[PDB]
């Protein structure tokens, strides 16, 4: 549940370090 | 260590157009949000933005949106508040603070903040 | 959308310390907490409802459900006396922060 919680949230603001996007 | 150092306190005028800046060391700069808050003396905090440096995307909030831009230096780990037209009403400590780029292995949250640049406008 | 704090708290010292966060469905998402001292810089202490960073102390503790998140401070000292903030990222451009509330351990 807090697993659930945990990636709805940083959805929100996940930015990936690989670069260019795949 | 890790850590965020700003500029020095600025007096300005209305109308001026104005610069700070936060200065990241000890970490790998691109991979981290820098958000900008600011503290009216004795009041709360308020966000005004935020930059992924990795690629310059930034975010508002609607009421500072047209007055303040964020832009972030890649080379020197520089993050950077600009206004093109001051006013009195931005009288206030600002502060950058690092945020997580969502992933577990990093702390979700401004887990390192600056030491704050105290701005004053007035005529 | 809007996070609700007590302006002011305070308790004796040993005692628990109890500082409330009001938002809508704030159970429904994050809450992370920091401490600022007079003329400092605000500190990290809880991240992800119920996470301490290092270097915080054991007695530090949160919770959130429902409509109320909650930070527990046990054994109360004076060195806790501060200001404390809740804060939330509501939406993708929305980051939110509670009013504030001014702890005092009664001296």
């Known amino acids: 549940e807090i697993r659930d919680k945990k990636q709805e949230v940083r959805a929100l603001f996940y930015r990936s370090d690989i670069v260019p996007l795949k | 260590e890790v850590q965020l150092v700003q500029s020095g306190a600025e007096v300005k005028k209305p109308g001026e157009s104005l610069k700070i800046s936060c200065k990241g060391s000890?970490?790998?700069?691109?991979?981290?949000?820098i958000g900008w808050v600011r503290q009216v003396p004795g009041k709360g905090l308020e966000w005004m933005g935020i930059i992924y440096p990795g690629d310059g995307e930034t975010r508002y909030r609607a009421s500072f949106q047209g007055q303040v831009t964020i832009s972030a230096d890649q080379s020197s780990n520089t993050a950077y508040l600009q206004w093109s037209s001051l006013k009195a009403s931005d009288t206030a400590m600002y502060y950058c603070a690092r945020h997580g780029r969502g992933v577990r292995e990093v702390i979700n949250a401004f887990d390192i903040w600056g030491q704050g640049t105290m701005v004053t406008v007035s005529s | 959308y809007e996070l609700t704090q007590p302006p002011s708290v305070s308790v004796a010292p040993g005692t628990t310390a109890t500082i409330t966060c009001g938002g809508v469905d704030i159970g429904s998402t994050l809450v992370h907490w920091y401490q600022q001292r007079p003329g400092q810089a605000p500190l990290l202490v809880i991240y992800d409802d119920s996470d301490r960073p290092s270097g915080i102390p054991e007695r530090f503790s949160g919770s959130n459900s429902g409509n109320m998140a909650t930070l527990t401070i046990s054994r109360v000292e004076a060195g806790d006396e501060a200001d404390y903030y809740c804060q939330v990222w509501h939406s993708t451009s929305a980051v939110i922060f509670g009013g504030g509330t001014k702890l005092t351990v009664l001296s």
């Open positions: 000890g970490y790998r700069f691109p991979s981290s949000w």
